[PDB]
Amino acid sequence: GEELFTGVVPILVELDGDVNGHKFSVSGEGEGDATYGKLTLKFICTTGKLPVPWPTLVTTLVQCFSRYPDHMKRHDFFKSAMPEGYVQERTIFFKDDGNYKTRAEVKFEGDTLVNRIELKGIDFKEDGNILGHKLEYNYNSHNVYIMADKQKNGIKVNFKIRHNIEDGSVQLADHYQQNTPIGDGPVLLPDNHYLSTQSALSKDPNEKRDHMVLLEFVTAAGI
């Protein structure tokens, strides 16, 4: 897959979610430039108002677009699984609140890199920081820790996202991730390393639908 990410690739994102019964759908389009670990996307809630804060959806809403330096190419599982793609599953535990469980398939459909997602959220407090919409519209920089999972011929991923709360406090979201290939072809199983992330959220001053504009940079490191 390395060769498939040398230039600007277009991206399409589709998420179907249900959090405590509140059903919703999100669509997103943009492009990724893995050579600069760059992502520019704009997401729309296609069913109306989003029943959770936009930032809680950022991790769910294409790590194959992370910049893997030359001396780490042999560790880029994400791109190695292309174009057949890979399944990405997660369990996001929101401290003192509910948890999201997600399953997605990211692969190529012609030239378009597609991320199809199903998200299920349960045990949220209808009046907590998530359902009550008390998280600020911003995003911090984190370190995504990656590990090989030889027995599953995939990887294991763990990290902690810190969502700023409107009162100055912090809402922790423990991420437990698993990625496995969709094809029966070989993939790169990586030594331990991590991805350094940063995201900036903004609004489109001409968009009336509930939405999020995301600019994100990610680069592999730790080796």
- CATH assignment at residue 150: 2.40.155.10
Q: Resolution of the coordinates in A?
A: 2.1
Asked if the peptide bond before residue 55 counts as cis, ω within 30 degrees of 0, the response is no
Q: DSSP labels for 44-100?
A: EETTSS-SS-GGGGTTT--GGGSB--GGGGGG-HHHHTTTT-EEEEEEEEETTS-EE
The most distant pair of C-alpha atoms in the chain lies apart, rounded to whole Å, by 49
Q: What span, in angstroms and rounded, lies between the C-alpha atoms of 90 and 15?
A: 14
Amino acid 177 reads: Q
Query: CA separation (Å) from 9 to 62, 102, 105, 110, 120?
Result: 12, 24, 17, 11, 29
Instruction: Report residue 25: phi and psi, to 5°.
Output: -135, 145
Burial annotation 124-136 (CB, 10 A radius, 16+ → b, else e):
beeebbbbeebbe
Asked if residues 108 and 83 have their Cβ atoms less than 8 Å apart, the reply is yes
Burial annotation 2-31 (CB, 10 A radius, 16+ → b, else e):
eeebeeebebebbbebebbebebebbbebb
Measure the N-to-C terminal CA separation of the chain; round to a whole number of Å.
Answer: 21
Range of the domain at 172: 1-223
Amino acid 94 reads: F
**Number of compact structural domains in the chain:** 1
Asked if residues 178 and 154 have their Cβ atoms less than 8 Å apart, the reply is yes
